[PDB]
Amino acid sequence: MNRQPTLHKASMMGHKVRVLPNEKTLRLHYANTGAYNADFDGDEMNMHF
DNA sequence: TTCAACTGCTTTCGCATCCCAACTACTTTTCCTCACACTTGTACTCCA
Secondary structure (H helix, E strand, O other): OEEOOOOOHHHEOOOOOOOOOOOOOOOOOHHHOOOOOOOOOOOOEEOOO
16 A cells, blocks of 8 residues: 555555455554555545555 | 756546538529411402
8 A cells, every 4th residue: 555655665555455345435543544645535535465 | 165957756436711501683494375577369340
């Protein structure tokens, strides 16, 4: 996963997949928001498989 | 041993002259409806 302005290497980390029903967006824990410089207000993140 | 032009670089996704037409004219397409000049007898007397 990476938040797109990739300033440091902790903004591109390896997550484990958890497939959640009934949902239409990617869905992330709060403990990961400091490393991506992320606030949940319309930000997007790319998911490479 | 220096002045002055030629020099590539600021970000990170996604957003975002020729033609046509107007109106009024004039004209052609033809088909239909009759007249205008010519002529022999007959009629009314004509001169024999």
